[PDB]
């Protein structure tokens, strides 16, 4: 449940540490983005000599949320923090070469199949 102004941790090695959602893409007046939803972000914090730099505006996919995801049985998977993977604006493919932390099966799609492969654990 990510909205504009929400701060997310980064689950990749792009070099961004903290990012802020500036837009939830995909609809008019769309309030929230869940896991698997692409968002527009600005890099608030970045590591030195990273691929990405502070103040850069790019896209990202939400991979973990505190609110969590609901499974067909009614089961819930929640995480301690909200996390995203930085994507190239045009390609919408992961900028980073590594994925850190567990990801949900909701990202099991052709678009985000690379992330699933890189991810250590898929829940």
Partner 1 sequence: IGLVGKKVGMTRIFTEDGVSIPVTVIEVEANRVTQVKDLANDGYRAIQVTTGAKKANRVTKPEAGHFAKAGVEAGRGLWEFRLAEGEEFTVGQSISVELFADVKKVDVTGTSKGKGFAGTVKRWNFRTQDATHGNSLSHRVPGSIGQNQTPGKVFKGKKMAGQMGNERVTVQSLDVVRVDAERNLLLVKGAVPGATGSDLIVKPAVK
Partner 2 sequence: SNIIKQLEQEQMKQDVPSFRPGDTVEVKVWVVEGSKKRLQAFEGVVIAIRNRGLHSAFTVRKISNGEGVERVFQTHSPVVDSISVKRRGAVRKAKLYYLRERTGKAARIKERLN
CA dihedral defined by 10, 16, 18, 23, rounded to 10 degrees?
Answer: -80
Decide if residue 32 touches partner 2 (CB under 8 A).
no
Q: And the tokens for 4?
A: 């504009």
C-alpha span between 61 and 18 (Å, rounded) = 14
Q: Which stretch binds partner 2 (CB under 8 A): 31-39, 40-48, 52-60, 94-102?
A: 94-102
C-alpha span between 55 and 77 (Å, rounded) = 32
Least distance CB 21 / partner 1 (angstroms)? 24
Q: Which is nearer to partner 2, 30 or 71 (CB)?
A: 71
Least distance CB 70 / RNA (angstroms)? 4
Q: And the tokens for 33?
A: 């983005």
Residues that bind partner 2 (CB under 8 A): 64, 68, 71, 73-81, 83, 100-102, 105, 108, 120-121, 123
């Amino acid at each position: 449940m990510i909205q504009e102004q929400t701060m997310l941790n980064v689950a990749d090695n792009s070099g961004a540490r903290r990012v802020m959602c500036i837009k939830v893409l995909g609809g008019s007046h769309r309030r929230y983005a869940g896991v698997g939803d692409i968002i527009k972000i600005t890099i608030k914090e970045a590591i030195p000599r990273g691929k990405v730099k502070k103040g850069d505006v790019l896209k990202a996919v939400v991979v973990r949320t505190k609110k969590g995801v609901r499974r067909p049985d009614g089961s819930v998977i929640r995480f301690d923090g909200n996390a995203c993977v930085l994507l190239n604006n045009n390609s919408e493919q992961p900028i980073g070469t590594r994925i850190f932390g567990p990801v949900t099966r909701e990202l099991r799609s052709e678009k985000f199949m690379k992330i699933i492969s890189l991810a250590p654990e898929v829940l």
